[PDB]
Write a protein that binds this DNA or RNA. Structure first.
Ligand SMILES: [Cl-]
Ligand SMILES: [Cl-]
Ligand SMILES: [Mg+2]
Ligand SMILES: [Mg+2]
Ligand SMILES: [Mg+2]
Ligand SMILES: [Mg+2]
Ligand SMILES: [Mg+2]
Ligand SMILES: [Mg+2]
Ligand SMILES: [Mg+2]
Ligand SMILES: [Mg+2]
Ligand SMILES: [Mg+2]
Ligand code: NA
Ligand code: NA
Ligand code: NA
Ligand code: NA
Ligand code: NA
Ligand code: NA
Lengths: 140, 95, 186, 154, 160
RNA sequence: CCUGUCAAACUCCAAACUUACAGACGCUGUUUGACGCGGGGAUUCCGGUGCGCGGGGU
RNA sequence: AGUGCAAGAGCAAAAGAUGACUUGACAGUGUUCUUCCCAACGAGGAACGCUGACGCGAAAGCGUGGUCUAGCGAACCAAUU
RNA sequence: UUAGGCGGCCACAGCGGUGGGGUUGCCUCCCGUACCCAUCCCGAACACGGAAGAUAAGCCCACCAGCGUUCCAGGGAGUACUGGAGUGCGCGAGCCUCUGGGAAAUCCGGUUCGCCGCCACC
């Protein structure tokens, strides 16, 4: 019952929403893998008229690349209760988001016979706080 | 009418009831009819192609051969005989 | 769900099992469909025709009933797929089926994949099916050579149960040879 | 089986209604015909409802009118018991009347004109501007009601 | 302009403001009168003014009749008397006038009217048994300012 | 929540009714040849009124 | 929401978005509907074919320009292939 | 169908919720990147290879009606509207009678938590 219910880290999305780049380099070195350009939608008066064009960059970390990042990333922030999602996620910091979920999440990410994860099987803020707090740090 | 195009006054007949909205099931678009069979003509709002002039909605004609994948249905408009090119998607078997 | 005006998708669309746009295009051929489907452990091939109350399967083959002919290996790989297609194709030939179009459902048209292996199998059985040779895996991989060379990097047997240590693409030949044989109880 | 009598003329009457009366073999005012009670015939009389008098007549009344106004398909010949006997599947007017009422046959099948050309109502009718329930002569009648009219148009 | 020009319902419903511009404002000041903070159920007597013929009542008439009715209730029960009166209809129908002769006759927009079917409640007042004859009087004055003949009907009220 | 109203260019609904085809009855046609085909000759293209349904207009 | 533009209609593993490739916005010739309900009438338009040559796709298949209904022009003469 | 595959009808099937079910069986989640293949970055997905573990998801089985939907009884209602007729009534807008049809809202009580087809399969 528990083994297939205990939380895990699906992805850690590190991103820097600049606005016009040279910052890709630092994300690459701090994460361990290639970055991705970030285009934008809708024209803005703040000299942001160009629709499709570099504005930010991100990196989605999975498995070891994520843990090996968080081991030195988490100690750089003071996690808060409010800083938590309703699905059991949290974003701190250059932004660093951590997507948490249970074992059978593939059911909602696959092509064939996909299905949305029932609320009961969805992670909670509390259940999330516990799992992470239960790994080198403190809550509140 | 204020205009004389094919879609004049077709607001009702070429619109789906909100629940029948969306891509129609393929079964009726691939139905096969034989020469001599009586078929009811009715445009399916969701299927763009294989249509006929909206003025003929409600007609019941006789399949008399085909042209490509479409069918050649014979009807009588008032007193005049006409041949209508139409796909299965807009046809239903009588009875 | 929300009200009288709400539009609920067709059942097989909710279930995310049938691509209706692809299905229509498939049915336009007027030919029977060679339904290639996979499972984590198995591979299924069916020759399906259109019917008044639903589809009609005139012939089929499952990777499980492959053992009935002398298969002692796993059932979710390339050799398994080809043989299941060949078996289904052979049963199709017996039922009077001469031609078919490959239906891969929600699977991806990836070069050298298992659905094309199923396709190659059915074609070799005698079925005329619109295809493209350079999208099929090269013969050796279908035999299961990629798996043997993988076990070559041994240190620990690839297969848990004992089918063999270094594996056998030769077993694939034995089975194909058995199926291509005229006798065989289909 | 109902007895139909046209009481209102063709002038100004709808063409589809006039054509209905003609299909029921009535082409003149005071002309009567006998009609079986079927769904098909029921619709026809309902459509003609406002220019006619109808209802199921009694055995006696039918016999009086048949004797007095029935005619052969062609010719003057009186339709009496002897005529009925020498030309029909029955022995006398009573047998024919009974058969008509029980809808077993028709005037045509027995070589008779489908139309009973009645005489104007002696003492006059109740009026062609109102139905029976309002004191008029139009529409469905009682068996006693139809008999009164048919006998007056003897 | 006489009401003879607009009282009948011989024209299509003309209320779509998305296709009609320049519609004059309504002269009707209020629809809820008396003590609007209280409920209708808090009263033993409920009397309604019923229209006997299907007609169109111009917004100018609704105001004049409502005014002459409520103005009476105010005079007899005070500016804060224990009662509440409601004008339930709103002048939705837009009116035109062809004010060139019959050429390009479609009229310009001149006003609004409320379509009332015979047997409907135009006004409904709620009062105590004491003030029952006062509301009957307000209505008498009210029906003298609208086109149709009316019935003053006592719905909830049997201290009779 | 409660409470007051509407739609020619609104519709979750929804008639009567009109209409395609077919069968049945009726009527009609096979010497009065219908239905239909081909050809000759027109007249006509200022209309009006009642009723029902209308749109404009006091 | 979006889908170039009126209005109404169509569209969600798409008819919309992104990316890539491509030139079928192809030549020839028809069937049919429309224009003109019924019911004759041209240009124009559309639907659906075939022949030829191509594009893309694993393939079924899609592409006779734009999701559909507006965006059009005789004879004589000239230029052009 | 002791969990499968392809479907037809396309909410009676939706939304939401409760309970139950898997030693070499089935579907899954699951484990894992040498290969075919793959991510404008990530074996996440797609693809390939595989069983140490699990029934918690999904799925299948049994069930609940609060919302949405389908149909049915009673009430609303033979009301609203309406095809045919009238030397019936009304100053008139309009109404009435006879004849043939006949709603909608809503209330109340039931129904509905899919049905059916082909194939495969302790
Ligand atoms: Cl057409
Ligand atoms: Cl599959
Ligand atoms: Mg309309
Ligand atoms: Mg004679
Ligand atoms: Mg006299
Ligand atoms: Mg008289
Ligand atoms: Mg009409
Ligand atoms: Mg197009
Ligand atoms: Mg000139
Ligand atoms: Mg030139
Ligand atoms: Mg469970
Ligand atoms: Na549809
Ligand atoms: Na002028
Ligand atoms: Na008055
Ligand atoms: Na033309
Ligand atoms: Na880019
Ligand atoms: Na489970």
């Amino acid at each position: 019952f528990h083994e297939m219910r205990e939380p895990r880290i699906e992805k850690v999305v590190v991103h820097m929403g600049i606005g016009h780049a040279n910052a890709e380099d630092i994300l690459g070195e701090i994460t361990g893998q290639m970055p991705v350009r970030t285009k934008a939608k809708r024209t803005v008066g703040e000299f942001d008229i160009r629709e499709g064009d570099p504005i930010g960059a991100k990196v989605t970390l999975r498995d070891e690349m994520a843990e090996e990042f968080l081991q030195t990333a988490l100690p750089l922030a003071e996690l808060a209760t409010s800083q938590f999602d309703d699905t059991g996620n949290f974003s701190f910091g250059l932004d660093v988001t951590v997507n948490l979920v249970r074992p059978g999440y593939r059911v909602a990410k696959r092509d064939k016979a996909s299905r949305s994860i029932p609320t009961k099987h969805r992670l909670n803020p509390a259940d999330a706080v516990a799992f992470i707090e239960s790994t080198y740090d403190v809550e509140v | 009418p204020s205009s004389n195009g094919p879609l004049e006054g077709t607001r009702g007949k070429l619109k789906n009831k909100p629940r029948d909205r969306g891509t129609s099931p393929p079964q009726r678009a691939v139905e096969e009819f034989d020469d001599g069979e009586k078929v009811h003509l009715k445009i399916d709002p969701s299927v763009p192609n294989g249509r006929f002039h909206p003025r003929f909605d409600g007609q019941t004609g006789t399949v008399e051969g085909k042209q490509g994948d479409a069918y050649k249905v014979d009807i009588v408009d008032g007193g005049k005989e006409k041949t209508i090119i139409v796909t299965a998607a807009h046809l239903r078997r009588q009875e | 769900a929300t009200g009288p005006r709400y539009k609920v998708p067709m059942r097989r669309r909710r279930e995310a099992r049938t691509d209706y746009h692809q299905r229509l295009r498939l049915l336009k051929s007027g030919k029977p469909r060679l339904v290639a489907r996979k499972s984590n452990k198995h591979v299924r091939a069916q020759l399906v025709t259109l019917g008044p109350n639903g589809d009609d399967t005139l012939a089929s083959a499952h990777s499980s009933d492959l053992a009935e002919y002398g298969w002692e290996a796993p059932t979710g790989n390339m050799p398994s797929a080809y043989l299941t297609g060949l078996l289904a194709g052979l049963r199709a030939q017996e039922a009077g089926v001469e031609e078919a179009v490959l239906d891969i459902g929600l699977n991806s048209p990836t070069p050298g994949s298992k659905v094309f292996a199923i396709q190659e199998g059915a074609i070799d059985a005698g079925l005329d099916i619109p295809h493209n040779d350079d999208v099929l895996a090269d013969w050796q991989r279908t035999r299961g050579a990629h798996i043997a060379e993988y076990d070559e990097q041994l240190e620990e047997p690839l297969y848990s149960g004992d089918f063999d240590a270094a594996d056998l693409p030769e077993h694939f030949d034995e089975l194909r040879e058995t199926l291509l044989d005229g006798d065989i109880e289909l | 089986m109902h007895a139909l009598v046209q009481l209102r003329g063709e002038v100004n009457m709808h063409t589809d209604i006039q054509d209905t009366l003609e299909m029921l073999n009535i082409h003149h005012v005071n002309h009567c015909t006998l009609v079986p009670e079927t769904d098909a015939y029921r619709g026809m009389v309902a459509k003609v409802n406002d220019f006619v008098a109808f209802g199921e007549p009694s055995q006696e009344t039918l016999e009086t009118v048949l004797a007095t106004r029935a005619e052969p398909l062609e010719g003057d010949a009186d339709v009496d018991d002897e005529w009925v006997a020498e030309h029909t599947d029955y022995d006398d007017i009573s047998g024919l009347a009974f058969a008509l009422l029980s809808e077993e046959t028709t005037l045509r099948e027995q070589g008779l004109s489908p139309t009973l050309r009645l005489h104007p109502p002696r003492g006059g009718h109740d009026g062609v501007k109102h139905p029976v329930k309002e004191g008029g002569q139009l529409g469905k009648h009682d068996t006693e009601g139809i008999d009164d009219l048919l006998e007056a148009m003897r | 302009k006489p009401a003879s020009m607009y009282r009948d319902i011989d024209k299509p419903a003309y209320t779509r403001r998305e296709y009609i511009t320049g519609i004059p404002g309504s002269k009707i000041a209020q629809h809820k009168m008396g003590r609007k903070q209280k409920d209708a159920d808090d009263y033993p007597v409920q009397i309604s003014l019923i229209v006997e013929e299907t007609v169109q009542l111009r917004h100018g008439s609704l105001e004049a009749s409502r005014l002459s009715a409520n103005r009476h209730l105010i005079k007899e029960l005070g500016e804060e008397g224990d009662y509440k009166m409601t004008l339930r209809k709103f002048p939705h129908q837009v009116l035109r006038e062809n004010k060139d002769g019959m050429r390009a006759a479609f009229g310009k927009i001149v006003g609004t009217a409320a379509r009332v079917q015979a047997g409907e409640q135009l006004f409904t007042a709620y009062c105590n048994v004491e003030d029952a004859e006062h509301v009957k009087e307000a209505f008498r004055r009210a029906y003298n300012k609208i086109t149709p003949s009316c019935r003053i009907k006592v719905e909830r009220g049997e201290e009779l």
